[PDB]
């Protein structure tokens, strides 16, 4: 997806390989980039949110809740991911669409919320638009927008009982929140180079990742609950090889890039998820920043 030169990649890998990871941004490994977001961006949508990164990418999510004829729980919710310029069937788009759905349907509590009555259920439509061209891996931003959107989602209050077809007050200000203030799941693209664990990686950083995980978490530091982990195929594997100065290389030559040839060391996987779930960690930082957005 992303394109970089081997010599450019070799510098990035070496810099992040140092004991204190010297990220190209100068950012701390625990530190996210600045976040700009909006809620209720689209009127007439039960929940909507916009998010734009310092990277320039932006995404908009809108939530439509429609009463449908069915404590009861079924995967009524459907997620759509509109990426500009894709064939509507690409690997990345469908993988993301399933991944975000996996997070919400992971506990199944979320399905329960959308249960108007035993006879009728709220079929929830989540439409995710990547406003910007896919300059970098959208997953982090899309997840944060979905988190913000669901938080902003309000559900029509039910004047009618359940056995009769449901009837709802019409005031959006009367309608109570979905996920009223468990939280909607956040998901962090976590990356590893050597023993260093990196969060919110830039496309340049992610291009040299030895390991990349999409970790979905929620809260009820905060009382975190792990929901899913998926291994993002390190884009580093698809990069060109480095050419040493004047066949199988016997030695890891300094400054010569070489795609990570194996899998993730077993311990690193524990380290990547351990650091995600540590109390007061990145998840708390993300939720603190996210929950500070007006709703």
């Amino acid at each position: 997806h992303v394109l970089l030169s081997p010599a450019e990649l070799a510098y990035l890998h070496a810099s992040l390989s140092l004991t204190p990871p010297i990220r190209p941004d100068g950012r701390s490994p625990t530190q996210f980039r600045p976040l700009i977001a909006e809620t209720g961006i689209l009127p007439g949508a039960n929940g909507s949110a916009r998010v734009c990164f310092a990277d320039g990418t932006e995404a908009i999510v809108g939530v439509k809740a429609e009463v449908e004829k069915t404590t009861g729980e079924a995967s009524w919710v459907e997620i759509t991911v509109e990426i500009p310029g894709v064939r509507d069937d690409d690997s990345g788009m469908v993988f993301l669409a399933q991944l975000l759905g996996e997070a919400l349907l992971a506990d199944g509590e979320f399905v329960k919320k959308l249960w108007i009555n035993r006879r009728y259920h709220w079929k929830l439509y989540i439409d995710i638009l990547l406003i910007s061209p896919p300059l970098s891996y959208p997953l982090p931003l899309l997840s944060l927008t979905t988190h913000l959107a669901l938080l902003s989602t309000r559900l029509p209050r039910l004047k009618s009982e359940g056995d009769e077809d449901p009837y709802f007050d019409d005031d959006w200000a009367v309608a109570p929140y979905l996920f009223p203030r468990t939280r909607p799941p956040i998901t962090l693209l976590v990356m590893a180079v050597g023993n260093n664990i990196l969060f919110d990686p830039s496309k340049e950083e992610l291009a040299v990742a030895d390991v990349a995980l999409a970790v979905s978490v929620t809260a009820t530091g905060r009382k975190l609950r792990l929901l899913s982990i998926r291994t993002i195929d390190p884009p580093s594997r698809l990069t060109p090889p480095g050419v040493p100065n004047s066949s199988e290389p016997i030695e890891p030559i300094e400054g010569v890039w070489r795609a990570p040839r194996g899998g993730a060391k077993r311990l690193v996987l524990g380290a990547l998820v351990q650091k995600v779930l540590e109390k007061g960690g990145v998840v708390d930082e993300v939720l603190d920043a996210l929950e500070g957005v007006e709703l």
Binding site: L226, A259, R261, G263, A264, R266, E278
Partner: protein, 281 residues
């Protein structure tokens, strides 16, 4: 479609059972297999000589002889010239195609290809690409095609069994194992054999949950979480980790155990994989 003999205009209904007696349904399946023992893997190599390398994998549904469940046919196609629309790639391009057999399709007539088929491709692609040496064969591509001949549970029936995701993890574990068998058969430079292990945290009683290797959701009253792992025992590396389930961060130990047993399942599966490959040559 133009390319297939369309069935009847009306939407056909899958058979719905009479369900005459509730009593007849009686007891719920209980896992007799020890918590640390995988299903009996049947693995064969060279099943499609036309391909550069191939393998076939089949599992007993509930460790019962003759009761076959998952069935996977894999045909690695050997490094071959890349299409000329994208005629160059510095690294060998691993391409994974996974398709449920029409017999195994969720719908006998389907408007849309299962998202599940695309998803399994990405997981398997990530798992195998880690285990395959791309540097060896620049300017070339290798295509791993998995045909999911049969699922461990009928697709339309799986909808009733809590969640298809658990079945998908079982399917992915098989895909990793069979694909590795095919890759070894095809003589594709691989860092290590990769086998697909899967493990689950389950709670079939009011007592504390157990960690169970190679689960099937029907055998358990509640799967709290599960993990699928493409693992390289000679490297002690994981090329594709997949986990799902609500686990409190306080239960980080359980997750760690869940992954470890999932890796243990991968080692167990790899045992069959090496045995099949050893006897193949």
């Amino acid at each position: 479609d133009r390319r297939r003999i369309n069935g009847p205009a009306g939407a056909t209904i899958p058979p719905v059972y009479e369900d005459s007696g509730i009593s007849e349904v009686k007891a719920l399946k209980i896992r007799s297999r020890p918590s640390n023992i995988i299903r009996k893997i049947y693995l064969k190599t060279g099943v499609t000589p036309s391909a550069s390398g191939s393998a076939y994998l089949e599992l007993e549904t509930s460790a019962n002889s003759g009761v076959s469940g998952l069935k996977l046919s894999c045909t690695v196609h050997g490094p071959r010239s890349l299409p000329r629309s994208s005629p160059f790639s510095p690294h060998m391009v691993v391409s994974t195609h996974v398709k449920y057999a029409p017999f195994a399709t969720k719908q006998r007539r389907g408007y849309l290809r299962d998202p599940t088929e695309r998803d399994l491709g990405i997981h398997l692609e990530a798992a195998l690409r880690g285990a395959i040496i791309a540097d060896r064969w620049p300017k070339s591509g290798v295509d791993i095609i998995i045909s999911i001949i049969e699922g461990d549970q009928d697709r339309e029936a799986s909808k009733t069994q809590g969640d298809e995701v658990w079945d998908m993890m079982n399917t992915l574990s098989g895909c990793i194992t069979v694909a590795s068998a095919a890759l070894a058969d095809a003589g594709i430079d691989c860092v290590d054999t990769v086998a697909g292990g899967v493990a689950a945290l389950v709670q079939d009683s009011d007592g504390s949950p157990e960690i169970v290797v190679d689960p099937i959701p029907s055998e358990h009253r509640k799967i709290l979480a599960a993990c699928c792992v493409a693992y390289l025992p000679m490297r002690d590396e994981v090329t594709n980790l997949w986990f799902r389930g609500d686990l409190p961060a306080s239960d980080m130990d359980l997750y760690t155990e869940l992954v470890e047993k999932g890796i243990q399942a991968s080692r167990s599966a790899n045992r069959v994989l090496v045995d099949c490959l050893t006897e193949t040559v």
